[PDB]
Amino acid sequence: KIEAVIFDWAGTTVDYGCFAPLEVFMEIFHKRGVAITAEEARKPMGLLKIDHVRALTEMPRIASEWNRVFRQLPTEADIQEMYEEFEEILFAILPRYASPINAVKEVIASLRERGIKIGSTTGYTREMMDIVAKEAALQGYKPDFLVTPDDVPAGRPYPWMCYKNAMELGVYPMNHMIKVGDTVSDMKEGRNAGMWTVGVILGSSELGLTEEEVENMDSVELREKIEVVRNRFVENGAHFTIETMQELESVMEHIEK
Amino acid sequence: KIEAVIFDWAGTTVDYGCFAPLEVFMEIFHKRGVAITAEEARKPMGLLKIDHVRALTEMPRIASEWNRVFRQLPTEADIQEMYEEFEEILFAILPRYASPINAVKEVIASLRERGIKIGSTTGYTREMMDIVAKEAALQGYKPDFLVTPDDVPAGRPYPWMCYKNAMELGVYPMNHMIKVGDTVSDMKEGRNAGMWTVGVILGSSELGLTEEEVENMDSVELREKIEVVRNRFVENGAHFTIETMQELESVMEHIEK
Ligand SMILES: [Mg+2]
Ligand SMILES: [Mg+2]
């Protein structure tokens, strides 16, 4: 029944905990004397990078501190300067985050043996993806297809990129495909496309932890942050949720019944 | 609630009985000393033209007859040559086959007044549609969007053309769109695409009759042929069937339940 699985990139396939963008947003502000925290930086993590910045700008705690430094509130010009800077820095360090999350590679290998096609969509622009995809392929991961917002009329949560994949992979109907992501938007997109939607937890942008803090966190404590997200997913359309990609072929087996 | 209707062209919105291609397909085979019947000629109607030709040669009855006449099955060269001919003959007559089927325009206008999007897919190439769509517009019919196989990996039965229509009209999921066509390939295209599928009988390729033949036929005989086409559309996936486009609106309402 299931002939293809469509994977997201950041916090699903690579970039454990999806920090690259977080790391950058913090820098552009820190260098302006208005240092923000991972929480509020990740707070928006889900909309256009351009609008993501503007969001931080309108965050009362940040807005005030900005008006303290520059003796004035952010200007549409500032947003545009901070956005240009965001990209330049992101391009620069994107390679350092393009490593396949330790579990994933073997999983992909297993699915390909079952004759199951591998697709993918993303929030990163084609420019960014070129860089991310290149480093990931060297490091062992390369989907059969990839699409970015640039390829379509609009990115997430629209199902456009998902249809493009089905088109190229040659798979139909949409319920013969699974969408796997690490954020609310990933769930929306999956449903809007009429496909089986799943959500990874450990290493997601939602769980926001690094491999380090995960391997060295209080079990009880961690087993709780996992739920604030696993639940968070189902509350957005995830026909299912998995702590790790190691549970993927299992969900497939379930679905196919 | 439905938001868009994707109409096929010939036999559905224009060219009553889809006659434009008919004699060209029979002519190309008749020059080789291999006669075919309209039924055969019409079987693959709706598919991309080159595919339609290849499909004809695939047909046992025809393949055997060709093998017997030439002492070998049809070749890619044969196919490619007949196609080159098919195009020459078709192009010089296409303008004469872009007239809207009688009451279709009232329907369309009614759909628009209800805020419904109008998309379309076809088996004709982009070059062919240039002629057909131009003439159709002058005669008052012009959907919001048009898609030929030249815009996607493949034509019918694949649901690719339907997805582009969805991307353009910005409608999702596919279950919010209805597909209307006059052939078997139109039916398989709707179910494959995951939308509500409908087949129109009077004027359809499948009915293969002209307006004269339909208004001057033994009523009893007529209702009987309608039944075969009808049974045929369903047999191939149609969710509902209608005799004319006047019924469409009503089937939409039924579905909205
Ligand atoms: Mg992501
Ligand atoms: Mg037709």
Curated annotation (Swiss-Prot), chains A, B:
Details of cofactor binding: Binds 1 Mg(2+) ion per subunit.
Name of the protein described by the UniProt record: Phosphonoacetaldehyde hydrolase
Recorded consequence of changing C18 to A/S: Kcat/KM decreases 10-100-fold
Native source species: Bacillus cereus
Superkingdom of origin: Bacteria
Membership in a protein family: Belongs to the HAD-like hydrolase superfamily. PhnX family.
Result after altering K49R: Loss of enzymatic activity
Reactions that this protein is recorded to catalyse: phosphonoacetaldehyde + H2O = acetaldehyde + phosphate + H(+)
Subunit architecture: Homodimer.
UniProt-listed Enzyme Commission number(s): 3.11.1.1
GO molecular function term, any single one: magnesium ion binding
A GO term from the CC aspect: cytosol
Record SUPFAM superfamilies: HAD-like (SSF56784)
Record annotation: effect of changing D8A: Loss of enzymatic activity
Role played: Involved in phosphonate degradation.
UniProt keyword list: Hydrolase, Magnesium, Metal-binding, Schiff base
Cofactor(s) recorded in Swiss-Prot or TrEMBL: Mg(2+)
Main EC class the enzyme belongs to: hydrolase
Gene3D superfamilies: HAD superfamily/HAD-like (3.40.50.1000), Putative phosphatase, domain 2 (1.10.150.240)
UniProt binding sites for Mg(2+): D8, A10, D182
